[PDB]
């Protein structure tokens, strides 16, 4: 019984990072060394587990998190980072056990005149906790003056769009990111490599 990894990695559409997608994976076998042996990736790193010898353990669940960011932000998808993405959109915990996989999606997520459909959160009252998703579209109060809805002086819509056109520098091109988490509960281990 094969884990649905094709459905995470090869989806026509990926999420905006503020609204990052999560897929709970259980009761299946997955070949992870097979996944690593693609020439396709800018980024394939694993904390606490190894990509190569990934095929010998079981787990209660795997989570596959996916989203699109700028190339210059892929660095922010790691434990202990700071910036707009790690603070306000997608936060990994300090003790993260799992893999971060990223690749240039310029051919799919750019178009003539720019693709403006991918959004990120620019403002927030405080940082995300690890694995927090914030989907709220409440106007942000940047000054001592209240808002009550409405854009104005020191009162901003908290989401802003990337502007992905084919001609951008590679730090400004879209990257698709997949984060795998591996969790053990005192409870049946159901997601295994072939051993």
């Amino acid at each position, epitope marked *: 019984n094969l884990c649905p990894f094709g459905e995470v990695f090869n989806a026509t559409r990926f999420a905006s990072v503020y609204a990052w997608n999560r897929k709970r994976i259980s009761n299946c076998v997955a070949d992870y060394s097979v996944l*690593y042996n693609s020439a396709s990736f800018s*980024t*394939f*790193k694993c904390y606490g587990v190894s990509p190569t010898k990934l095929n010998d353990l079981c787990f209660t669940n795997v989570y596959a998190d996916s989203f699109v960011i700028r190339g210059d932000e892929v*660095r922010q998808i790691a434990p202990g980072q700071t910036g707009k993405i790690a603070d306000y959109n997608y936060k990994l915990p300090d003790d993260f056990t799992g*893999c*971060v996989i990223a690749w240039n999606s310029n051919n799919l997520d750019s178009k003539v005149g720019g693709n403006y459909n991918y959004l990120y959160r620019l403002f927030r009252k405080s940082n995300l906790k690890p694995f927090e998703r914030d989907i709220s579209t409440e106007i942000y109060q940047a000054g001592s003056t209240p808002c009550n809805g409405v854009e104005g002086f020191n009162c901003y819509f908290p989401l802003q769009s990337y502007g992905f056109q084919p001609t951008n520098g590679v730090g400004y091109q879209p990257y698709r990111v997949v984060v795998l988490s591996f969790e053990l509960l005192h409870a049946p281990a159901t997601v295994c490599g072939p051993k």
Partner: antibody
Amino acid sequence: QVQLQESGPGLVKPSETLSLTCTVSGGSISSYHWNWIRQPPGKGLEWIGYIYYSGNTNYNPSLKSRVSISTDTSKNQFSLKLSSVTAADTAVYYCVREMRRGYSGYDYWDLYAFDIWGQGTMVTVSS
Amino acid sequence: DIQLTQSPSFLSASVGDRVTITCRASQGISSYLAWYQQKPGKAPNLLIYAASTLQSGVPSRFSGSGSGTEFTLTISSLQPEDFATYYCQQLNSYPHTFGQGTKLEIKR
């Protein structure tokens, strides 16, 4: 403290291929990320390329068409080939190790300082 | 792609002096900056990484500071053995680039 030793000829004819190998002792090829650096006489440092034994490489764009870097995990080595050389390639060539990453695998968006250098080897391009 | 310029290019200073060498990046690089000391006929040697972390084995008279585009290597209390060429390196993005080197000679 891991030790790196460059070896290969100190003399290469113009238009031929410069070949160097770095033999590593004190740690494994597979635990680290490796680069080639060179220094023309009385000039600065120039980065040549990077390799992680997954086979993943990054080459200086100025050299990219002439450069090849590879690893051999069984002999605990990595290698450089610089094709069709001129006098402009005359230099001290250094193999280096990067500071250890807190993860396995690779990331084009993450770069590390060079904590261990070989002694360097002089290569002259001359007929 | 990212250019580094050091200043000064050459300097003589007395033993016991405080010496500052600067590195300018052509765009922001956060704290992604290393410094090396290279003595004649030797490999460069890593003094500082992440702009201000002292590498183990490096005497405490070397220190680094800065963020963004402006970076400083300080030698408090210059020693005769500090004769060398000093190099900054950016760890922001490929390609790896170095500054042009700052040659420090000891007055006596």
